[PDB]
Design an enzyme around this catalytic site. Structure first.
Site: not given
Ligand SMILES: Cc1c(C#N)n[nH]c1-c1cc(F)c2c(c1)C(C)(C)C(=O)N2
Ligand SMILES: Cc1c(C#N)n[nH]c1-c1cc(F)c2c(c1)C(C)(C)C(=O)N2
Lengths: 546, 546
Positions: B334, B465, B523
């Site tokens: 990720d 992010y 995920h």
């Protein structure tokens, strides 16, 4: 007044210069003079090499572009490149041959020690070659000794472009007149001179250093031999392993390669190996410098039995188990040296090789109490003074700075009387309250030990001497054994307690024993003679420990 | 009722038995039957072999005694041992050939998981052979899975002597009727049976396990495939490196060999790699499982810019520098996967090899804002919800157990809506307050994450992010490059955000790219499909990372 020194990498901090290989290849291949150097710099600021140096492309993408410029240059010059012509082979060899220019690094080390801000400014590339690790190792070794490393491929700017120099000054936080700039390329020196910096054109190192010492007013040439690189505790990787519910062991860790576990003595610390840690990691080893049980950041339970050899050895085995290490080489000094011999005797499968500094291997005498044996030799009286719980703790914890300043002294700086410690009532009864700082240590190094011993004091550390009967019973179980794994015994000429002659019978028990001997060396081996300890240990590891 | 299981090593937990090699050598050399087995046991309790097993002598001291007994036995039998007869070569081969008996270890693992106290009781030796490491590795792997390891050479007692059995019972803190004892030597089982223990004579593993399951009432044979070994946080070596004055990075460390640095994603931990750490260390690697900046025991500064790719990458380089590592293989998942691609692009000399789980390498588009690019795909809306400082922190920190139980679920257990997160006002707006525990995780594993996130919360992790513009500007500098070092891209069939098709153009930028693909994987790759992640990573490391 100068306060910053900047050094180039290729041809300055590292020799032979990767650049000069273009000329050697031309000569070996009988190619036109400057052909390879011309294809290398082809296009100038618009060329392949400038894109490489700015970080636009990697070294592997650059290789075929350089091949194309070599074809073009040979075509114009009406010559032919030989059959097996490979730019890759040429550069692989050149990079591999390049080594740290030791006297240049030493000069950089001296200026930084004297307060200068030091930096490396280099036109370099992003190396993605299968053999890139060689260069990564060199950059790693060099970079640690400087405040800054400025790489062209990382900043997107190249020398002689004026912007990289203004970038250099901003990073240094200094005006141009405060900077000495050393470069082997006159063209790359020009913008720094134009800005007002002191500039040195490096051809031969010696003349460059003469220019360097004349301008800084600091002796850089003909200086005494430097001590090995030490450790700054705040810059190390610190490791913590719980070996049992109430016991955690702390260690400092540096390097890659076979595991080398360093075991200090009494009353010391992981920091006793400060001069060995960088050297052994640089020699290709993964160093684990312990805080032994009772010390520093390691747990210090109060019970005497927690410090017997059997328990200490079992915990070091568990330490290996939790770290996932099937083996380590065990190197010990003083009490650490005694533990490593017992690790070799009881857990040989877990000991890659064993080395002791000062501490001989003397087998237990089953016909005599260890109490009796210690009494026989007057130099061991300090160990009888350590027997009674609380006595030695009180004197040693009373004033920590005084304790460590009095202990950590060279063989000629003794302020301590070892005969009749008990009778006189203590180690420091006729010793100064404020001793002079030994030539072996700085005030800062002493204060590190003081700070370490503030946590747990001397109880745990003294308990290491309080298991003579328990240890003797355990050692007796090993009387029919021999140590047959690789082993090294290092004697110290001037250790007046752990005398070299006490090691004379070791070959009876360790037939393949190797030796080292350090002249004019007292008890505190690692800090007394670090260069020689490093030389002996590295030579022995490389021959016997893989 | 049974509550303890004891297993022998040779012929029980490890096969082929070192003992059975004496018979094979006799047959291969056409020596009289039992000649080598007779010389091995010569003297019984007074013999060389018993002294070896009790720890009186080492294996290297025993070798010439065994040679002497082989001569004696051949002389009596009126036969001749061949020229190149070497006991050492015979035992070196036998020890090396011996491997863990996987189904036996699995049965021991199941009983311990079901509450049994497990132990290994073995007649073994102190191995000081040049090749002792092979055995140390095997003992290391096996011992970790048991409560106790009792070695004859360490306790000074041997089976079938009655004292070792009373020693066994004392260590187990159990009465004989509560113990199952498995041994391949009937003579060594006899004292345990006589004491009242349940005894199993191990010939073939399958029948022994049938006897084992019948007596314990626990399914041991035909059971579903077990998950790989996980990590108990309190049993790991924890490392701490200060990369800059306000920034420390924490890691868990296991194994020896090339450095493998594992980089988790959002919102995870070093513990996300719990199923990979023991496996990769067992495969011959030194695993460094990070707490990435913002997480767990690592520093979590509040500033957004502290989490841009350029700073995160520089700190990982400094992390390598302080540990004295010139390179590591970088494996990320990720956000960790995104960092590892940029490490390969900007610091290829420091990256031995690179692998990403789920995260593709997609080059920055210089003609479009990253804000624009994210808006184009509806599956990325959660990332827009993460933009506004404080919003996502409030919802995620509100109830930690609920956050982690809602997130860490398999592809079919989704309780979360990924489309219109912003519009709906949060990730958990139409999700349960007390979600069911996913089949992937235990309550204990969830509570570990809850405890980790109590320190710093979600600010630092969300800041990863919040650097889209800064990251895009930095990535644009790399647009003329290719990744040419060894690389592996692992896709997960059921990751609905980081879909396998997003990785389809990677070969344009990484021409030599290798791939792995995991079917029915969501995920949370490492905990969703650990066995398959382990298989892919180990295969790739052994072929491409050395
Ligand atoms: C005094 C002291 C303490 C304390 N408190 N711990 N260890 C020692 C010590 C040990 C040694 F072996 C040797 C020495 C000192 C000298 C006399 C320097 C030597 O030559 N050997
Ligand atoms: C919801 C969430 C948070 C939070 N808070 N962090 N990361 C993610 C996330 C990221 C992904 F990439 C994927 C998924 C979830 C699912 C939907 C499980 C998937 O299939 N991919």
């Amino acid at each position: 007044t100068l306060r910053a020194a900047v050094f180039d990498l290729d041809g300055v901090l590292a020799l032979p210069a990767v650049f000069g290989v273009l000329g050697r290849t031309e000569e070996a291949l009988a190619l036109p003079r400057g052909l390879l150097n011309d294809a290398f710099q082809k296009g100038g600021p618009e060329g392949a090499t400038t894109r490489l140096m700015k970080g636009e492309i990697t070294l592997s993408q650059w290789i075929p572009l350089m091949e194309e410029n070599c074809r073009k240059c040979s075509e114009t010059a009406k010559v032919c490149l030989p059959k097996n012509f490979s730019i890759k082979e040429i550069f692989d060899k050149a990079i591999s041959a390049r080594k740290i220019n030791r006297p240049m690094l030493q000069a950089a080390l001296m200026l930084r020690k004297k307060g200068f801000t030091t930096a490396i400014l280099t036109n370099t590339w992003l190396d993605d070659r299968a053999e890139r690790d060689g260069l990564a190792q060199l950059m790693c070794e060099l970079k640690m000794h400087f405040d800054f490393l400025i790489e062209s491929c990382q900043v997107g700017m190249v020398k002689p472009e004026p912007q990289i120099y203004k970038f250099l000054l901003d990073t240094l936080k200094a005006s141009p007149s405060e900077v000495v700039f050393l470069d082997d390329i006159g063209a790359n020196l020009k913008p720094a001179r134009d800005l007002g910096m002191v500039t040195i054109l490096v051809q031969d190192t010696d003349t460059a250093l003469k220019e360097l010492e004349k301008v800084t007013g600091i002796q850089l040439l003909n200086t005494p031999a430097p001590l090995p690189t030490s450790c700054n505790p705040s810059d190390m990787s610190h490791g913590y392993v719980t070996v049992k519910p109430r016991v955690r062991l702390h260690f400092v860790e540096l390097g890659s390669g076979p595991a080398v576990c360093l075991c200090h003595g009494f009353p010391e610390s992981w920091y006793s190996w400060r001069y060995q840690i960088p050297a052994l990691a640089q020699a290709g080893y993964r160093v684990l410098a312990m805080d032994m049980k009772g010390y520093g950041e390691s747990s210090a339970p109060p019970e005497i039995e927690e410090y017997c050899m059997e328990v200490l050895c079992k915990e070091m085995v568990t330490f290996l188990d939790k770290l996932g290490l099937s083996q380590a080489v065990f190197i010990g000094h003083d009490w650490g040296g005694m533990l490593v011999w017992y690790m070799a005797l009881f857990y040989p499968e877990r000991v890659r090789a064993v080395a002791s500094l000062n501490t001989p291997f003397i087998p237990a005498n089953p016909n005599m109490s260890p109490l009796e044996s210690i009494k026989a030799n007057p130099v061991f009286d300090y160990q009888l003074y350590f027997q009674e719980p609380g006595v030695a703790e009180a004197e040693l914890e009373q004033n920590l700075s005084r304790t460590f300043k009095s202990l950590f002294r060279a063989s000629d700086e003794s302020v301590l009387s070892m005969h009749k410690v008990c009778e006189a009532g203590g180690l420091f009864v006729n010793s100064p309250e404020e001793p002079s700082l030994s030539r072996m240590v700085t005030e800062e190094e002493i204060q590190f030990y003081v700070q370490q011993f503030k946590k747990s004091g001397f109880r745990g550390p003294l308990n290491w001497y309080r298991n003579m009967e328990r240890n003797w019973k355990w050692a007796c179980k090993s009387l029919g054994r021999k140590i047959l794994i690789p082993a090294l015994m290092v004697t110290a000429e001037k250790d007046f307690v752990l005398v070299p002659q006490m090691s004379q019978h070791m070959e009876d028990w360790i037939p393949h024993l190797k030796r080292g001997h350090i002249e004019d060396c007292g008890h505190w081996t690692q800090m007394d003679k670090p260069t020689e300890v490093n030389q002996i240990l590295i030579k022995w590891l490389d021959s016997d420990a893989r």
